[PDB]
Design a protein around this ligand. Structure first.
Ligand SMILES: CC(=O)N[C@@H]1[C@@H](OP(=O)(O)OC[C@H]2O[C@H](OP(=O)(O)OC[C@H]3O[C@H](OP(=O)(O)OC[C@H]4O[C@H](O)[C@@H](NC(C)=O)[C@@H](O)[C@@H]4O)[C@@H](NC(C)=O)[C@@H](O)[C@@H]3O)[C@@H](NC(C)=O)[C@@H](O)[C@@H]2O)O[C@H](CO)[C@@H](O)[C@@H]1O
Ligand SMILES: CC(=O)N[C@@H]1[C@@H](OP(=O)(O)OC[C@H]2O[C@H](OP(=O)(O)OC[C@H]3O[C@H](OP(=O)(O)OC[C@H]4O[C@H](O)[C@@H](NC(C)=O)[C@@H](O)[C@@H]4O)[C@@H](NC(C)=O)[C@@H](O)[C@@H]3O)[C@@H](NC(C)=O)[C@@H](O)[C@@H]2O)O[C@H](CO)[C@@H](O)[C@@H]1O
Ligand SMILES: [Cl-]
Ligand SMILES: [Cl-]
Ligand SMILES: [Cl-]
Ligand SMILES: [Cl-]
Lengths: 245, 245, 245, 245
C-alpha cells in the first residue's frame, strides 16, 4: 500500500515514497496534476525535488520525481534511463502518475529544467502526455553527461570496451529517437524556454526543433533572460505559472 | 487516472482496466487483498479472470490480472513474460498492486492454477509477496507452452533461427531462476496443491520442490482429487478458501 | 615463487599450480616440452588434465593446462577466452611456458582434442608455437558451446540483449580470426586428426582448412577410426606419440 | 625458455630479456627479491633500468623492468598501462616475478621513483606485493604525462576525438582507482619519500595520502632533501638501502 512505500523522509512537509527504485513526493489536490522532474545537482549534492514551493499553496495535485539511484559513487541519476538503457524507469513513473492522479491527461503538466526537462520529454513522448513546459533541455544526452560527470557516463557506457562507441551513440540519441517514434496525431502542447545567454542549449533546442518539425509537431519556444543558471530558472518558473493559469 | 484506464469491458459488474498493456479488474475492500492470475483459455476463447465468484461477495480488496495481449494470432498470453523476455510485465503488475492495494504484503494472497500459478510464483518470488496459494504450476514453462500452442511458442522464440534454441532454454528455466535468486530470509508462506491424477504436474512439483529445498525454503504441498481438470480446481478453490478464512 | 603457487592438489603425483586464475601441472624433464589443454568435461564433472599417463614415464618436460574457472555455476571453462573476450588467459599460459620450459620452441608440442585442440590452436597461432598436433577441433566456437552448455554460452554472450548477436559472431569467429591474422612465414607443423565417423568435426576441419589454405599454410590431416569419442582419442594418442618420436 | 627471450642488449653485464613486449633484467640470488621500475628518460634517450649498481654487488635476487615500447615516435613508456588502457602489462610483469623469483612476497621489495614509483604502486596494489618503497610518485598521471610528452599523451588518448576527454580522465585516475579497489586487509608496508623542494609532488602525495586514509590503510612518508631531481634520488637510494638492510 502507498503508506508502506514511505522512505521516512519529509521534504517541506511532504512525505517521500519509493516504488521500484523510483523516489517521489505526492500531494493530493484538485483541478490539475503537476509533475516535476529533478535535474543534475552539483557533485556530492543530493538530488532535489523541483518546484515544491510553487505549488504547495496551490492545492493542485503534485508529484515530484527524482532520477535513479545509480551509479553508487555518483548517485545523481542516469537521465531516467535504466541500467539496461531501456524504458523501465519511465514505465514505473507512468504507472505512479496514472494510478495516483485524479485528473485527465489534458489537465496534467510535466515540468523540468535541463535534465529534468529531458525526463519530462522522455515520459511525455513515450506515454502521450500532451502538456510539457520545460526549460533548456539537452538534445545529445551523452555529450552533456560527459561535461557533468565522467563517472556517470562511464557507468552508462558499460565495461566492455568494444561497445563503448555504440552505447555512446545510443544514449546520445535516446531522446531524438523518442521524437522520431512519437504519435504525431496527438494534440501536443509543448513549451520550451531557454535562457538567451545559454548558447549551448540554444543550439540543442534547434536540434530538438528540427526533429519535431519533420514529425509535423509545432512547439512553442520563448527566450528568457539568463544563461543555464538560476536567473533563467526564475523566469521559467514565472512562465509555467502563467500558462498553467 | 484509474477511471481513464477503462477498456469498456465489464466482467460480472466489475469494469476492466488496462495499464501498459496489463488488463485487470479491481474492487476496493478491507482487511485482505486477493490477487488472481489468468491461466490458458481454450484456443480462440478470450482470456478469463479467475476466482471472481469466490470473492465478489467478500469484503476483501480484489485484483484479477490477465496475461499479455500478444501474439495477435493467438493472444492467450506469454506466461507473464514480455516480448523482450524480461520482467517488464511483472513490474507493471507490482506497481498496480502496490498503489491500489490498502493492506500489507503479509495480508496479500496470490492465487492461480496452472499458468496462473506460475504467474503468481513469478510475481511473488521477484517482489517478496509471501502468501502464494496455487495449484499445479509448471516447472519447465517452454515444454508446456509447446503443448498448448505452437503459435505462442514460435512467437516467443523469435525470428532469428540461431537464438531459437537459446530463447527456448531461457524461457524453460525462467521460473527456476526466480527460485534460485529469491530472498531465502523471507518468511515464505507458499502452498502448492496438485491433483493426484495429474501425473505430469506431480513431476513438475518434484522439480520445484527440489529448487526450494536447495534454497533452504520449506513450502507446504497437498494432494487433492482430480487431474489437471476442473475437479482439482474445485478442491483447490475450497483449499484456498479455508486457508484465507 | 613457483612453490607458493601450489593449490594443494595432486594429480597422479603431480602438484597443481595456479597463477592468475590459470591452473596447471608442471613436471621438469629433458629434450622436449609437451603442452596439453583440457576439453569440455561432462556436466558436473571437474575439468581434467589431459594425457598425463602418456608422458609420466617419458621424462619429457610436461605442462598440462585447464580452462578458466568461469561461469561459477558451470565451471567448465570459456574456451580459453577471458570474461572480456580477449587474449588475457592465453597471455598467462604463454608466460608460464616461456619461463618454465627448458627447450626451444621447435622442441615444444601443443596437444589437445575438441576444445583442447582449439586452445592449442589459439595459443599456437597467437604466439608462434609451430608444432600443433590436435584432434577434432571446432571451427565455429559459439555454435558448439550452444550444443554443450547454455549456461556457459549465455555467460560469454553477456547480459545486454542488444549485443547478444554481436558477441555470438565474435566468439564464433575467434579462432578463424586468429588464423586470418597469423604469421604465414612461420614453418608451421600443424597436424589435425579426426574420427572418421565424426561428421560434425569433419565439416569443421574443412572450415579450418579453408582458412589455412588462403593464408598459404599447408597442414597435415589424418582420418582415424571412431567418432567424437574415446576411440578417436585412443588413436589420436597413438598418433601424437608416433610423430613426437 | 628464458634464454631464448634475450634481446641481445647487455646492461652492466646483465643480459636483457623480453616477454610479451616487457623488457627486463634478471639476476638470481638469495634471501630477498628486489624489483625496480623505470622512470621517464629524457627525450630521445633510451629507457633505463634503475638501481642496478645498488644491488649488483648484493646477493639478492634482482629484477629490473622497463615501461612499454610504444609509441614508436617517443617510446618512453605509457605508465605501465597497455594500448587498451588495461592491466595486460602489469599482468606480464606479475607472471615474470612469480615464476622467476625464489622468495615469498613478504620478502619482495618494489622500488622506483616518479613514474617508476607509480609502476611499483600499480603492480603492488593490483597483486598484493606488500613492500613498496618509492619516491615522489604522481597522483594525476595524465596531467604529468602532458608535461613530459605531448606525443605519448596524444597516443594514449586515441584517434577518436569524442573519447579523448574520456580516456584522459580514465588515465588521470588510474592509480587512484587501484587504491580504491585494493585489499585493505593486507598488511601493507608502503614507504613514500619526497623531496622537500618538490612542491608539485608534495601535493601529489597529499592526494595519495587521502585515498589511503579513506581506505583505512596507513603508510609511512618521509621528507628528504632536494626537489624532483638527482639529489632526492640519492637520499631515497640511501633510505631504501637502510630499510632493506
Ligand atoms: C556547467 C558544468 O558543466 N559544470 C561541470 C561540473 O558539474 P557539477 O555537477 O560538479 O556542478 C555544476 C555547477 O553547479 C553549480 O552551479 P549551479 O548551481 O548554477 O547549477 C547546479 C544545477 O542547478 C539545477 O539543478 P538543481 O541543483 O537541482 O537546482 C534546481 C533549482 O531548485 C532549487 O530548489 C532552487 N533553490 C531554492 C528555490 O531555494 C534553485 O536554486 C535550483 O536552481 C540545474 N540547472 C538548470 C538551469 O536547470 C542543473 O543543470 C545545474 O547543474 C556550481 N557548483 C558549486 C557552487 O559548487 C558550478 O560551479 C557548477 O559548474 O563538473 C564537471 C566535471 O565533468 C565540469 O566539467 C564542469 O565544471
Ligand atoms: C555430445 C554433446 O553435445 N552432449 C551434450 C551434453 O553435454 P555434457 O557436457 O553434459 O556431456 C557430453 C557427453 O559426455 C559423455 O560422453 P563422452 O565421455 O564420450 O564425452 C565427454 C568429453 O570427453 C572429452 O573430454 P574429457 O572428459 O576431458 O576426456 C579426456 C580424456 O582424458 C581422460 O583422462 C581419459 N580417461 C582415462 C585415460 O582413463 C579419457 O577417458 C578421456 O576421454 C572430450 N571428447 C573429445 C573427443 O575430445 C569432450 O569433447 C567430451 O565432451 C556422456 N555423458 C555421461 C556418460 O554422463 C554423454 O552422454 C555426453 O553427451 O549437454 C548438452 C546440453 O546443452 C546436450 O545438448 C548434449 O547432450
Ligand atoms: Cl542538469
Ligand atoms: Cl494453463
Ligand atoms: Cl570439448
Ligand atoms: Cl618520470
Amino acid at each position: 500500500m502507498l503508506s508502506n512505500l514511505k522512505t521516512g523522509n519529509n521534504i517541506l512537509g511532504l512525505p517521500e515514497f519509493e516504488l521500484n527504485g523510483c523516489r517521489f513526493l505526492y500531494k493530493k489536490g484538485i483541478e490539475k496534476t503537476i509533475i516535476t522532474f529533478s535535474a543534475f545537482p552539483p557533485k556530492d549534492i543530493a538530488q532535489k525535488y523541483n518546484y515544491i514551493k510553487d505549488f504547495l499553496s496551490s492545492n493542485y495535485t503534485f508529484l515530484a520525481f527524482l532520477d535513479t539511484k545509480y551509479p553508487e559513487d555518483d548517485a545523481r541519476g542516469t537521465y531516467y534511463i535504466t541500467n539496461e538503457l531501456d524504458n523501465g524507469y519511465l514505465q514505473t513513473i507512468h504507472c505512479i502518475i496514472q494510478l495516483l492522479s485524479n485528473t485527465n491527461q489534458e489537465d496534467t503538466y510535466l515540468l523540468g529544467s535541463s535534465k529534468g526537462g529531458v525526463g519530462a520529454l522522455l515520459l511525455g513522448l513515450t506515454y502521450n502526455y500532451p502538456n510539457i513546459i520545460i526549460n533548456a533541455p539537452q538534445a545529445k544526452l551523452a555529450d552533456y553527461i560527459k561535461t557533468r560527470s565522467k563517472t556517470i557516463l562511464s557507468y552508462m557506457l558499460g565495461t566492455s570496451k568494444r561497445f563503448q562507441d555504440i552505447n555512446y551513440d545510443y544514449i546520445n540519441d535516446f531522446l531524438l529517437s523518442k521524437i522520431k517514434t512519437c504519435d504525431s496525431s496527438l494534440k501536443w502542447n509543448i513549451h520550451i524556454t531557454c535562457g538567451k545567454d545559454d548558447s549551448y542549449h540554444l543550439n540543442e533546442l534547434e536540434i530538438l526543433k528540427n526533429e519535431f518539425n519533420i514529425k509535423a509537431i509545432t512547439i512553442k519556444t520563448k527566450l528568457i533572460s539568463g544563461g543555464h543558471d538560476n536567473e533563467a530558472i526564475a523566469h521559467y518558473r514565472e512562465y509555467f505559472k502563467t500558462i498553467i493559469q
